Each structure stands twice: as C-alpha cells, then as structure tokens.
C-alpha cells in the first residue's frame, strides 16, 4: 500500500524549510572558528573504559576538469596520484585512502600492465583503498537532473562491480556548492548505507553544530515513514582542505598539513608552519592535536571521530606520502601509548568510520535526529551566496537536457533487438553515457570551469551527440523494415535527426531542408519516436523546400497540416533595428504527429503543383513603424503591416492570449467567458557591484534590484494559424517568442548577451497572484519543494535553482514556468516569478576559477506557461514542504525534456517500410515512466537482460476523471521472459524475484528498476 504523499506532514527533528524561518543568519566573528564559536569540552567525557576514537582519512579530490581538461588534469595530476596511490599503500599495509571519481580510475586502470593491475585489486580486496561513491563524477546537486545523476552513478559502479568486484555503500560529497535530498533518494535505491556533504550555508553548520545535528537521517520531505532515510554526516567547518578538518582553529590544523613547509611552495596562510614531529615535539604536537580532534568530537554524539586528510589533487608526489605518512604514525604512536588521552587514532576508510559510528549507535551509545529539506542557497561567508551558477554558461546548461533526452532515445530504441558487434551500438551507447557522466560533474553542468575546458566538454556532448544519432537512425531503420529486406549498412545514415529546438533557430543553421519537386523527388517518409510509455500527440516541423506540402500517413490517409515562412532575425548593423526576414527557398510544413507508447509512426510529405486539399497557410504580421516589404518566395499569403498594436491570439479552443503593443504577453483568458488574467512578461537586468565582492561564474552578487530593459520601439511580427500561432519581438539582447498551439503556450528566448558586461539578464512575470512570500522549484527535475523568500537575507540568498520548473499559487490560481534548461530564479516580490536567462561577467569571484565570464553564446531557451484555477485541486497542508504539478504543468514539462524525435529518410526510395512500431505496447497511467530502458547483455550471451528504470510522480487530484490506462507491465515488453526480477537502480543487485515474471507499477514519488532475462 503505497504512502500518501499529499496529506500526511512527516514529523522530522528538523525540517529545513521552519529552521529557515527561525535562525537569524547573523554573520559574527567566532573566534579561531570564525563562523561557530570557541568550543569546550569535559577533560573527562573519555576514559579508559570509553575512548575517543579517531580515524584519519587520507583522500585526494580531483576535478574530471576544471582550470585544466579531463586530459591536462590526468596527465599532469592524477595519473601520478594513483601510480603513487598504488606504489605507496602496496609498500605500506597500514596506510589507507579513499577514492571517489571512477571516470579517471577507469582511464588510469585501463592504461595499467596485468601486474600492476593484480596489484591495484589486491590493495582494494584487503581494504587499504575504498572506493566512496564511485561515481563517474562527483555531480553538481543543483542543475543536474536526477535521471543523469542516476546515470553517472551507474556508469561508475558498473565499472566497479566488473573490474574491481566492488559496490560502494558509502558517498563522498564534499564539493558540490550546496546539497539536494536527490542524492539520498537516489543513494538509498542504489544499497548505500551512508553519505557525507561539506558544502552547506555556514549559519546551517553553526546552527546544526549546535545542536549535535550534523549527523542525521535524511529523509525525502513527504516521507512519512521514514523509508528513505539514509544517514548523512555534514562535516562542520568551513572546508574539506586540511585546515579545516582536524578542529575548530585552522592555525592549528594548517601545521599537520605536512606538505606546507617549504619545499612543495606550500605555506600556511596564519603564518605558523607544520614542523617535522621528532621525540622532543611529539608531547606538545600531540597536545595541540588531540585538543582540536576532542573540540570537533563534542559536535558529535559517538566516540568516533571523522578527520579527512586531503585537498585538491594531493598526495601527487612519492615524497608527500612519505611526509605525510611518517608524521601522522609518529603522532598516532606517542597519542595511542599515552593512557591521559584515552584516545585511538589510526588510518581508516570512510566506510570504516561509518561501521564504527554505527556500532556505537547499536551500543545505545547514541541517537541520531531525523531531517528533511535541502541545503541551497549555499554561502559560504558573509553574503557570498552561490546562486551565480545556477544560471553560468547557460548554452551548455540547454545542452545537457538535448542529450539527457538523446542518450535515453538511443538506449531505448536500440533496445528491442540484440545488436552483432559489427553495428557498434555498445561503443557508441557507451561513450555518449560517459560524455554526458562527466559533464555532471560540479564545474561541468554548473558552468564554472575556464573556457578551455568549457570548450572541451561541448567537444565531448557533441560527439555524443552524433553517436546517438547514429544508434537512433540505425534502429529506426530496423525497426520499420520488413525483415526479409532489412540490409543493413552499419556505417550508412539512413536518417537525418530534425531537431526544431536544438541548438535552435538563430544559433546554428544545422537543420536539412527537405528538398522536394516535380522534377527531382515528389516524396518523403518522415519517421517520430515517442520514448514515453502513452500514446502521445504533439505538433511537429520540417523544413521544405516547396510550401505546396501535404501529408499522409501510412494508410494513405490525409493528414491536415499547416504551412509558415521560416522567419531568421537579424541584428541588423545598418538600420540598428532587430528584425525579421523571410526565406523565399524553405518554408515550415506543420503537422500532429500521432504515436504510439514507446515507438514509432511513419507519415508522407508529397508535392504538389498548388495549394493541397488539407494544408492550410498562416497569416503574418509584422508590426512596426516604417515597414519594408518582406517577399516569401512561393508563399500563398501576402505578408500584412501595421503600426505597433496591442493583439490578441486564441488557437484551437485553448487559452486566449493578449500581448502589449510590445509583442510581450499581458494577459491569458482560459475560456471565452472567463476573466483577462493579468500575466504580464518583462524583461530586467541586474548589475555588479562598482565597489566589495563581484559576482562571478559563482557567486550572485547584485547591485540592487534589477532594472527594467529599455525596449525601445522592438519589431513585433505575429503568425497567425489554424494548427499553430505565434508572437515573436526583437528586444535587446533577446528574440522572445510566444507560442500558441491549442493549450499552454510555449515560450522561446533566443538569447544572445552580446558584450553586455557585467550584465544578468532576467525574465520575469507579473500577476497578480496572492502568493505572499511562498514559491515552489524543483530539486533535479524529481520534486517540488515549497520556498519562503526571506526578506531577513540578500536577494541573492532568496535565488534558487530551477532545474525543470517553478510556480505559485494562492487559494484559486497558479502560474507554472517550465524550462528545459537548468537556471536561477525567484520569486522576489508576491505574483512574481522570474529566472535568469544568461549573465556576463568581467570579474573573477575568487573561488579558483580564476577568469569572469565572458564566453557567452547564443543560446535558446525553451518554456512552457500554465496558468490554471487550482481550487479545486487536493493540495497538501500549509505545512507541509512538498508541493506536486497537475497534469497539465507535468506533460507540458515532457514536452519540453522528452519530446517526439524525427526522422528524415535520407535516401530516394525507403523499401519495405512499415508505418508504425509499438501499437500494442500498454499506454500507461500519464503520472508514470519508463525513464530508463537499457540492454544490459551484448549479443553473445545466452541469457539476454534488459533493465527498466520505472518511476511515478505524483500529480494533483482537481477533478478530471482518469482516462483508462494500462498496466505496465516492464518484464512482458520482450518476448520469451524467463525471469523478472527487481534490483537497486544501477542493476547490480538483484533485490527481489518477480513471481509471474510480472513487474509490480511503483507507488506515486517512487522510482523501482527491474530486469528482465529472456532466452536468446
Ligand atoms: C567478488 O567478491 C565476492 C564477495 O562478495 C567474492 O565472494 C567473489 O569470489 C568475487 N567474485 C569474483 C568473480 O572474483
Ligand atoms: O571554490 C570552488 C572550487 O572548490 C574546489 O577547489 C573544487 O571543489 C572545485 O571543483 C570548486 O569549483
Ligand atoms: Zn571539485
């Protein structure tokens, strides 16, 4: 029986959302421990029947690129921290260290000769190095979404399992700039028993210290039982570096860095250096030491003391290990045989510390608190809060979701067959899953890593990019052949991919026309996939090269259609103005695809000589003072011109749209009766402080509210159509577009920043919604979390990530945003909702990257906006921290991340085709999917395996009776099932055996993965 996720307000110790609303956030000197206060301890709290244990953790954290690429780093860097790693705890059986970036182990490993590589599994299977996590990476929390953290996990641990024979069951957090639940929703799928965080607002940590509550159960914010909880430790100080993790004073602690006294141009910042421990210093040494280790224990509640030992890219060079080693084992001697300590200090693994903790939990020594919540904004002083890299290198942050969708396309389409080693369909899988892995790493996704580097990780999507393409188009063309004609040429296209939003109109003309006439090619068989588990229809666009187009399915059945110019604006150098031009060689055909759950639908385009029976052709409207002609080649329809005017657009019998006299939207009418609901687009821009802390790629650090953009007189042009219509205007910086295709309107930023410096550009909304101080956004496109704009913290502080989408509400109505890019926004004033667009920056904000943010390109930003009456809908008490979509604001967000992909049959002549694929796959309930189908068995096995990730959200009960669905059954998908059996997300461990072969449908807000093994 599943929880109910709606009705029930988990009672938590603390619940991050109410701390919010008490703490006070006051930034105040603490001492040696500037953010905390100068801790004390009882001299006896340990004795000889109850000791201070304390497990030193040697680590190294290396960036999958950041100042340097992947490459630069592991040649320079990392290939010797692990040639060292292994020398030097082969040598040493005592010595320990963790690691946490499998994506470099892998590179490093497969590089290894057989005996070097006997060695590395030897000092694994004997415990001296741990893998924490094993992830690909160490993702970004905040833009990443949820089905690529899962996907970089599994990447990672499925390396593990096969060549290290291990799984992680404790996670290595200490870097991401604040910290999402995601993780343990995830984590706690996938058999982890254990995490660790580090980066989380000061105040937080000073607030949780003092309370003993920075070891907790975390779990998810509707979880009233309590199934998800994963135990979470936050360490307590300002940094993971060495400084920071002995103890309270980084004065002290700075001088057991043992690679800070001279000869590796290390120093010590508080201008006391680490000496060389000898006889004669080890009592005095060990006295400080100890004295740090016994303050840090009293934020805790066990008798086993955490102390990470590294920083970024150590234990590089033999003679740090050495130097590092050798001082810790002269203090550890002296402090373990001197009784007045009562302390036990040793080397250990992060797993290790976690057993211990445990078994002092299991001993009654300790109980620990229950949470949830998450844990952004991050600051990590004064009013430096992270918010800035919400929005950074927004080109690459659009990217992401382009080939989130791609990846799972091309798993999932290629999928249903088996696949000879020949057609490289593994190789091709794999290297984009590790392409797309490594950019959700914490300066990929977050868009802080220098221009080089950013440069790099597009270079790597791009080819990822490419290979699915080729996977889809190769399993497009199997999958609509009749069989006995199916040949095959592995290396031949087949299909061209038509992509409409990516990289998008005005950023790359990338697009292939489909060249048509009466004298060269009178047809075409187009081709739409829909990896969503119902039956879907969405409108679709192609380019051709004639506008008298029709289509057909493959029943030869007309299909009605839309023709529009293909409008390319310009900023135009000579007459100063951005405006529109026509082409009078392509043209737009328009079209409802209509496509079954999990497949594939086939339709014609055909010329003819004059306008077709059931194509219809769109008016248009350019709108400006002093107009010129705009000529459209073959176009049926005469371009009209007016003065600038208010206008108002109602497609289908969807909402009625009004716009200002400035193309931009300033209301919506949802039926012909109903109220002009003022919704009001505008477009702002904030600046950078002329004196104190400067925003970077980073940090949000705005001088005041933003400004309103002055729009001038902009060129509006409006298309108006049966099947689709729109309002688009050239404003500075940005060609904002509105579309309107019968329900919740799309929205379209091409936005090009230009040399704008030191300049965010906003987009905001203005209802007149009763919201007050409350907002929702999503954690990593998985959950909505309530928000309350603290007017107590900076501007900046009330920025939050929006990963997929945000919205408000009062008692009647709501506004949702969707996006399909992860940016920064707020809601900063009631009826307000606003998200950052892009943001150049002439400054660095002194976090490492070491350069501002002036690599801006044009990107296109997608949207949808739901406006709806709520009243009616089952919503969750105003207590409760959750907040869920309706069904609308959900299949609007899959429109925009998972929408129809199209086909273009490359060739002449496409023989044997077949019209549909997946008629008879089940159409599932619309809350659930499938978001991962992927073979798991390359041909040669006789049992084949296929793994389903399954998960349902929870939408909102406002009335509309449910439509029969089918049940999805994931297992009975094949033919010939010999077992069904559920597993942790990553498939690497079989959890329950399926009676019936049947996979059970998950419960709302769960996530369940199944595997299902066939004979071959
Ligand atoms: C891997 O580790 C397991 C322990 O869980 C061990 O029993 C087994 O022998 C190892 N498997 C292989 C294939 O070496
Ligand atoms: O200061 C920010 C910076 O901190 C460290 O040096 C690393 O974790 C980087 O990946 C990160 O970008
Ligand atoms: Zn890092």
Same mark, same amino acid.
């Given at each position: 029986q599943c929880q109910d996720v709606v009705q029930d307000v988990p009672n938590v110790?603390?619940?991050?959302?109410?701390?919010?609303?008490?703490?006070?956030?006051?930034?105040?000197?603490?001492?040696?421990? +500037?953010?905390?206060?100068?801790?004390?301890?009882?001299?006896?709290?340990?004795?000889? =029947?109850?000791?201070?244990?304390?497990?030193?953790?040697?680590?190294?954290?290396?960036?999958?690129?950041?100042?340097?690429?992947?490459?630069?780093?592991?040649? =320079?860097?990392? +290939?010797? !921290? %692990?040639?060292?790693?292994?020398?030097?705890?082969?040598?040493?059986?005592?010595?320990?260290?963790?690691?946490?970036? !499998?994506?470099?182990?892998?590179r490093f490993y497969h590089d290894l000769g057989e005996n070097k590589k006997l060695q590395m599994k030897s000092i694994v299977k004997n415990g001296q190095l741990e893998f924490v996590t094993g992830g690909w990476v160490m993702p970004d929390e905040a833009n990443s979404h949820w089905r690529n953290v899962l996907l970089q996990l599994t990447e990672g641990q499925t390396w593990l399992k096969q060549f290290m024979n291990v799984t992680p069951t404790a996670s290595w957090a200490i870097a991401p700039f604040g910290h999402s639940p995601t993780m343990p929703y995830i984590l706690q799928k996938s058999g982890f028993k254990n995490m660790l965080i580090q980066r989380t607002h000061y105040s937080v940590k000073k607030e949780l210290a003092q309370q003993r509550q920075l070891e907790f159960l975390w779990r998810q914010i509707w979880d009233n039982k309590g199934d998800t909880a994963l135990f979470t430790h936050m360490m307590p100080f300002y940094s993971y570096d060495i400084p920071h993790t002995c103890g309270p004073d980084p004065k002290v602690c700075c001088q057991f860095d043992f690679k800070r006294m001279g000869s590796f141009g290390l120093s010590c910042p508080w201008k006391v250096p680490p000496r060389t421990i000898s006889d004669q210093n080890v009592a005095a040494r060990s006295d400080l030491l100890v004295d740090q280790w016994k303050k840090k224990a009293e934020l805790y509640r066990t008798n086993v003391l955490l102390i990470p030992l590294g920083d970024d890219f150590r234990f590089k060079q033999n003679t740090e290990w050495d130097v590092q080693r050798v001082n810790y084992e002269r203090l550890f001697e002296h402090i373990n045989s001197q009784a007045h300590f009562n302390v036990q200090a040793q080397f250990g693994t992060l797993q290790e510390y976690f057993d211990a903790v445990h078994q002092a939990e299991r001993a009654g020594q300790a109980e620990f608190p229950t949470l949830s919540g998450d844990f952004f904004t991050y600051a990590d002083r004064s009013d430096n809060y992270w918010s800035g890299y919400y929005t950074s290198r927004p080109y690459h942050k659009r990217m992401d979701r382009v080939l989130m969708h791609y990846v799972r396309a091309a798993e999932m389409l290629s999928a249903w067959h088996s696949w000879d080693g020949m057609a490289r369909i593994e190789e091709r899988l794999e290297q984009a899953r590790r392409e797309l892995s490594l950019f959700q790493h914490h300066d990929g996704i977050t868009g802080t890593a220098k221009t080089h580097v950013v440069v790099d990780y597009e270079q790597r999507m791009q080819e990822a990019l490419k290979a699915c393409q080729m996977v889809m188009q190769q399993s497009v063309y199997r999958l609509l052949t009749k069989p006995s004609i199916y040949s095959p040429d592995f290396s031949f296209s087949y299909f061209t991919l038509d992509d409409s939003r990516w990289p998008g109109s005005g950023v790359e003309d990338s697009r292939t026309t489909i060249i048509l006439g009466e004298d060269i090619l009178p047809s075409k068989h187009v081709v739409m996939h829909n990896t969503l588990p119902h039956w879907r229809e969405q409108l679709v666009d192609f380019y051709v090269s004639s506008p008298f187009v029709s289509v057909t399915d493959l029943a030869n059945n007309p299909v009605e259609a839309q023709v529009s110019p293909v409008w390319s604006w310009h900023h135009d150098t000579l007459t100063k103005t951005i405006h529109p031009q026509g082409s009078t060689t392509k043209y737009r055909i328009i079209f409802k695809a209509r496509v079954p759950p999990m497949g594939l639908a086939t339709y014609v385009l055909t010329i003819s000589d004059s306008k077709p029976e059931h194509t219809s052709y769109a008016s248009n409207l350019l709108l400006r003072k002093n107009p010129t002609s705009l000529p459209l080649g073959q176009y049926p329809e005469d371009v009209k011109f007016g003065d600038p005017r208010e206008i108002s657009l109602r497609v289908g019998n969807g909402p009625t749209l009004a716009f200002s006299e400035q193309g931009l939207l300033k209301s919506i009418q949802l039926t012909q009766d109903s109220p002009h609901v003022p919704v009001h687009f505008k477009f702002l821009k904030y600046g950078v402080r002329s004196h104190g802390d400067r925003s970077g790629a980073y940090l949000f650090l705005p001088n005041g509210p933003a400004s309103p953009v002055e729009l001038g007189q902009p060129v509006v042009l409006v298309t108006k159509g049966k099947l689709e219509s729109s309002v688009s205007v050239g404003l500075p910086s940005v060609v904002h577009q509105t579309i309107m295709r019968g329900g919740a309107p799309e929205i379209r930023n091409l936005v090009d920043i230009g040399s704008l410096d030191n300049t965010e550009i906003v987009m905001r909304l203005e209802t007149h919604i009763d919201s007050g101080d409350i907002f929702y956004t999503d954690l990593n496109g998985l959950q909505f979390i309530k928000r309350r704009r603290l007017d107590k913290l900076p501007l900046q502080a009330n920025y939050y990530p !929006?990963?997929?989408?945000?919205?408000?509400?009062?008692?009647?109505?709501?506004?949702?945003?969707?996006?399909?890019?992860?940016?920064?926004?707020?809601?900063?004033?009631?009826?307000?909702?606003?998200?950052?667009?892009?943001?150049?920056?002439?400054?660095?904000?002194?976090?490492? %990257?070491?350069?501002?943010?002036?690599?801006? +390109?044009?990107?296109?930003?997608?949207? $949808?906006?739901?406006?709806? +009456?709520?009243?009616?809908?089952? $919503?969750?008490?105003?207590?409760?921290?959750?907040?869920?979509?309706?069904?609308?604001?959900?299949?609007?967000?899959?429109? %925009?991340?998972?929408?129809?992909?199209?086909? !273009?049959?490359?060739?002449?002549?496409?023989?044997?085709?077949?019209?549909?694929?997946?008629?008879?796959?089940?159409?599932?309930?619309?809350?659930?999917?499938?978001?991962?189908?992927?073979? %798991?068995?390359?041909?040669?096995?006789?049992?084949?395996?296929?793994?389903?990730?399954?998960?349902?959200?929870?939408?909102?009960?406002?009335?509309?009776?449910?439509? =029969?669905?089918?049940?999805?059954?994931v297992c009975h998908l094949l033919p010939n099932v010999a077992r069904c059996e559920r597993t942790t997300l990553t498939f690497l461990q079989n959890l329950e055996h399926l009676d019936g072969m049947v996979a059970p449908e998950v419960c709302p807000m769960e996530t369940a993965a199944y595997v299902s093994s066939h004979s071959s």
């Open positions: 110790d603390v619940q991050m959302l109410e701390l919010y609303d008490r703490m006070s956030f006051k930034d105040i000197d603490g001492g040696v421990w +500037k953010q905390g206060w100068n801790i004390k301890y009882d001299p006896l709290k340990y004795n000889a =029947h109850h000791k201070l244990k304390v497990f030193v953790v040697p680590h190294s954290h290396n960036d999958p690129g950041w100042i340097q690429t992947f490459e630069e780093y592991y040649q =320079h860097d990392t +290939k010797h !921290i %692990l040639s060292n790693a292994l020398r030097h705890l082969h040598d040493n059986p005592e010595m320990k260290f963790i690691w946490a970036e !499998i994506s470099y182990f892998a !929006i990963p997929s989408g945000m919205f408000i509400e009062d008692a009647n109505t709501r506004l949702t945003l969707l996006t399909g890019q992860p940016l920064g926004g707020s809601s900063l004033a009631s009826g307000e909702l606003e998200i950052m667009q892009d943001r150049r920056l002439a400054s660095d904000d002194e976090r490492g %990257l070491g350069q501002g943010v002036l690599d801006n +390109k044009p990107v296109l930003h997608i949207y $949808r906006l739901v406006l709806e +009456k709520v009243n009616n809908c089952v $919503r969750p008490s105003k207590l409760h921290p959750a907040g869920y979509l309706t069904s609308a604001a959900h299949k609007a967000s899959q429109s %925009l991340l998972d929408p129809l992909d199209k086909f !273009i049959f490359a060739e002449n002549e496409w023989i044997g085709a077949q019209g549909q694929f997946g008629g008879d796959h089940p159409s599932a309930r619309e809350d659930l999917d499938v978001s991962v189908m992927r073979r %798991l068995t390359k041909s040669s096995a006789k049992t084949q395996r296929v793994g389903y990730v399954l998960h349902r959200t929870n939408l909102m009960q406002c009335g509309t009776p449910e439509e =029969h669905t089918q049940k999805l059954d």
